[PDB]
Design a binder for this molecule. Structure first.
Ligand SMILES: COc1ccc2c3c1O[C@H]1C[C@@H](O)C=C[C@@]31CCN(CCCN1CCCCC1)C2
Ligand SMILES: COc1ccc2c3c1O[C@H]1C[C@@H](O)C=C[C@@]31CCN(CCCN1CCCCC1)C2
Ligand SMILES: *[C@@H]1O[C@H](CO)[C@@H](O[C@@H]2O[C@H](CO)[C@@H](O)[C@H](O)[C@H]2NC(C)=O)[C@H](O)[C@H]1NC(C)=O
Ligand SMILES: *[C@@H]1O[C@H](CO)[C@@H](O[C@@H]2O[C@H](CO)[C@@H](O)[C@H](O)[C@H]2NC(C)=O)[C@H](O)[C@H]1NC(C)=O
Ligand SMILES: *[C@@H]1O[C@H](CO)[C@@H](O)[C@H](O)[C@H]1NC(C)=O
Ligand SMILES: *[C@@H]1O[C@H](CO)[C@@H](O)[C@H](O)[C@H]1NC(C)=O
Lengths: 534, 534
């Protein structure tokens, strides 16, 4: 050995950089490769481990971000820009980042972050994912991995070994394998690794809990506004095939064989695939993405529901929850009547249009059922009630109720469940008020941005961030978010019987029960029975 | 002429009796025949007008009551006994009663009461129907008619002229014809006749509004907790036929022809028919009666819904409304878990049983829809919530929502609609508290029983009765319950747009809108669409 910033791993030596953090410093090892570049003939293929290298790998700067659709709806607006790639895009994008406390610990709790982005976008390098605050404040080794998204990570032609599907999930698994095998050299304890992620990242976490091939690579899990059984998080192999073929058709490919199709798709430049990616969806919809995980019978042995029902999944502790207004982000971008600069009061006709877009797979009776369930017939033309009702429909159907179904099924076999409901609207949010507590906006509290004065949060928002970070890190470390022997209010364990959860905000803790049961019994029990019968 | 108690009608002379009323007196002509006794070979047949008679008809005492099932669930209990026949039963039961103010008026407003009893029971002679208080207090000529009930009034073998069906409705029409032709001799104005009735009596009123053969015989109408489109108020000719045949089977009749069946049924004593009447229902249900009106294409030209939709009905003014807890009476008598002497807190299993009994015609998905709509999933084992939820289900499905559908359809073509919601629980009610404001218990306020000291009502209950009687009588007289130029609170007209209604109780008037819209959109729009699709 020789330096705090020099670490020798089983793949080779790596040189980090010292980084300033809240008046102190820590080490950062950025852009460490964990797989061979998935380029050329390797596009769509399972990832291959990175060949060890001679010399010192320079890990002082962020890596490229994977090829992805870029949001240009509000050019320059920080609200949407904060999610876009902040590094050059490239198919050579399989890297991970590690923030290590200083002095380098010996065997401390490890947290691995899996970014979201609907499986079609996302980056490990975003300012909101800067792991130095959490690593520094809670003294954990914080890792953020990356994985292929869009067609590159999820194009699926089941049966072929050239584009089997789920390779983006396999990229994540390879990074977890690299962490298992090498994090000890950075002072992390590979026996105490917690994977956590948001939205598609949270669904990913749940997928690794389910997939037998991933279970052994981590200890505990945290899922933020995402669940493996979300209606948008996976497709059948038949639907995946249908979309891969349709993509081919959009690029004038030869469709006579998987081989012809894949070869053609492999000759296209990245942007050519991204330019027609949205043309393959089966319905006019919102909260539906083209290339996502496939129930292949390999990564996922059987249907997610049967795995959940039989307990065919990793049994450990989990901490998860949702935000109050999960649907607003999606309505703003794709439902008629909504806009960034107006209060977006929704007419009755636009409500109807929104319902249709929100539950694309529903027949007319189904649409009537949804509409009835969310319409106040004493005040049906209330623009605000219609706007908020759509917000709830999108959020309940796509995030909350799927998570609540997962929570209840998991808890029957698990070793500990902690549930939260994040409902604090940040004081400095740039999005309009009508959007409320937006999908993805608890992340900045989990990563400690509020402790940064220049970001302009309130003192109570800093207090909230510290509490959340300490809950997350204590759970990662012990399997319980609560400090043993503490005097603070206790976050109750969610049990099959009591189903307790806590609100997460700047007010004194408050415990509740049966998070949105009324609506979720409709989404998880009644509606699917209706659609299957009719 | 010679006496105040002697009246010469087109059918013959009638001698009434002077009756004491609140320290004063009025004339009463009881038991006047309006049809030929429907006995022997006339059983099941349309009624025939009463042959005029020589001499003076003695109208000093009540007539017999029609043959009917007698309630023996609570022997001697006044709560149920007050509805039972208080006179000897006989098939010779087609009579009417008239209360005439003294001095005999010249041409005053007439009100004709049509009793309820689920089309299988009822009497014009009940203490709660004593018309002297209303006749005296509001100075109206009050008439109460009678009509055949049960198999005697509604056995239906469409196609045959011996038992065509609807003859009980024809009995009512004949009495309205007699009133049209003769009430002028009692000082009533045949141009200003208001028909009013409760439950089956209210459905009857709506049926005369619909039936072209009855329309010309009255001016205005009042419907209390009953509507012609109620799910229990009529059956198809096929279902009527099926039940007539099943009755025959219960009595070991020859079923080879309508003639064989009818002849056999005609030889049976009345009680033999009554003893097996309940064995013909198609489902295990509550709020369903065996022999009721049939959509025959004669009394009712087409389906009730198409008549309502096209405006094929008498256009005039109507005053109608419902009671708060329409379902309790029915649950007490036929749903498991309910009893007269306990609070009847309902278990979850009994709720399920109740739902099934309440919507007999629903498939499983339908039952799930109902259950979901009325279950508080944050507190599903609340015995009181389950009990009250069943109360609402039975009331909304059988009375309230059908009436609200009728109200909205009628109002599009009518000349004035006044709607009420009676929610006062009488201080001296003998039924338990859990039953609330019971089906049929606004009648005593409409007939003025509270003005009778010995009956023990409160002073405010007397005030309520007087207000209601004056609303009813002023509406009968003018087509508007409000006193022109009065200073009292005004009962707003129900309009297609505003849908206003008033509560009827001892508190100061309060106007509301869209009486139970949420539940009624479920019962009138969603559920039937669900059942028809699935
Ligand atoms: C399934 O959930 C999502 C689907 C798509 C996206 C996100 C997301 O969750 C968010 C927070 C985080 O996970 C990253 C990106 C997300 C916000 C940024 N948009 C950028 C494109 C515009 N986008 C369209 C979908 C609705 C949000 C706005 C991509
Ligand atoms: C369709 O509405 C009803 C069906 C049946 C009955 C009545 C009724 O409404 C009531 C008030 C009035 O219209 C007369 C009788 C009614 C109360 C007395 N019961 C006596 C038998 C027991 N009965 C069974 C049915 C539920 C009420 C109690 C008969
Ligand atoms: C998590 O699992 C552990 C066991 O692996 C549970 O602890 C055991 O609980 C049983 C029954 O309460 C005791 O008989 C054992 O002695 C305990 N063993 C240990 C090592 O503690 C624990 O209760 C589980 N927690 C949850 C929430 O399911
Ligand atoms: C009930 O019907 C009468 C007509 O038969 C309505 O009164 C007429 O209203 C129109 C339009 O408002 C006037 O032009 C006529 O001069 C009125 N005629 C009479 C005799 O008043 C009355 O408005 C109707 N009421 C309701 C509630 O529909
Ligand atoms: C590491 O590589 C980056 C590439 O731009 C550079 O900024 C940094 O100075 C390099 N340091 C060393 C020791 O090569
Ligand atoms: C009328 O008939 C009834 C029958 O019981 C009787 O009570 C009454 O006294 C009779 N009056 C006359 C004048 O016949």
């Amino acid at each position: 050995d020789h330096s705090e910033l020099l670490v020798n791993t089983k793949s080779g030596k790596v040189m980090g950089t010292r980084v300033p953090v809240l008046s102190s410093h820590i080490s950062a090892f950025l852009g460490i490769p964990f797989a061979e570049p998935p380029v050329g003939n390797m596009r769509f293929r399972r990832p291959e481990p990175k060949k060890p290298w001679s010399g010192v790998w320079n890990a002082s700067t962020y890596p490229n971000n994977c090829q992805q659709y870029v949001d240009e709806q509000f050019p320059g607006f920080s609200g949407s820009e904060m999610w876009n790639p902040n590094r050059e895009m490239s198919e050579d994008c399989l890297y991970l980042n590690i923030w290590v406390p200083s002095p380098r610990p010996k065997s401390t709790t490890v947290m691995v972050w899996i970014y979201g982005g609907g499986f079609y976008s996302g980056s490990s390098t975003l300012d909101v994912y800067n792991g130095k605050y959490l690593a520094y404040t809670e003294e954990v080794v914080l890792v953020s991995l990356s994985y292929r998204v869009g067609a590159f990570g999820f194009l699926a032609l089941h049966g072929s070994q050239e584009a089997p599907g789920n390779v983006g999930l396999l990229d994540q698994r390879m990074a977890l394998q690299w962490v298992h095998d090498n994090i000890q050299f950075f002072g992390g304890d590979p026996k105490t690794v917690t994977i956590f992620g948001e939205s598609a990242g949270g669904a990913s976490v749940g997928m690794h809990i389910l997939s037998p091939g991933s279970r052994d690579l981590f200890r505990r899990a945290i899922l933020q506004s995402g669940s493996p059984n979300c209606p948008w998080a996976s497709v059948s192999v038949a639907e995946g095939r249908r979309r891969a073929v349709e993509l081919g058709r959009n690029l004038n490919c030869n469709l006579n064989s998987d081989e012809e199709l894949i070869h053609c798709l492999r000759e296209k430049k990245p942007q050519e695939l991204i330019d027609v990616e949205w043309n393959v969806l089966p319905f006019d919809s919102i909260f539906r993405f083209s290339f996502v995980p496939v129930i292949d019978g390999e990564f996922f042995p059987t249907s997610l529901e049967s795995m959940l029902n039989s307990g065919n999944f990793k049994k450990t502790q989990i901490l998860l929850g949702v935000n109050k207004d999960e649907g607003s982000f999606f309505l703003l971008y794709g439902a008629p009547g909504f806009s960034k600069d107006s209060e977006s009061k929704i007419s009755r006709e636009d409500f109807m249009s929104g319902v249709k877009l929100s539950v694309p797979h529903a027949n007319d009776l189904g649409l009537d059922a949804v509409t009835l369930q969310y319409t106040d017939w004493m005040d049906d033309n209330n623009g605000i009630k219609n706007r908020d009702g759509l917000d709830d429909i999108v959020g309940d159907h796509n995030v909350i109720c799927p998570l609540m179904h997962f929570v209840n099924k998991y808890t029957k076999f698990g070793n500990g469940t902690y549930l939260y409901f994040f409902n604090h609207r940040a004081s400095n949010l740039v999005w309009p008020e009508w959007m409320g507590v937006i999908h993805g906006y608890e992340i900045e509290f989990v990563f400690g941005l509020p402790l940064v004065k220049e970001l302009n949060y309130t003192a109570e928002e800093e207090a909230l961030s510290r509490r959340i970070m300490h809950y997350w890190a204590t759970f990662a470390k012990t399997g319980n978010p609560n400090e043993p022997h503490s005097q603070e209010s206790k976050w109750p364990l969610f049990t099959t019987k009591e189903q307790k959860f806590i609100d997460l905000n700047t007010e004194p803790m408050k415990v509740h029960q049966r998070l949105r049961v009324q609506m979720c019994v409709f989404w998880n029990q009644f509606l699917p029975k209706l659609l299957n019968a009719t």
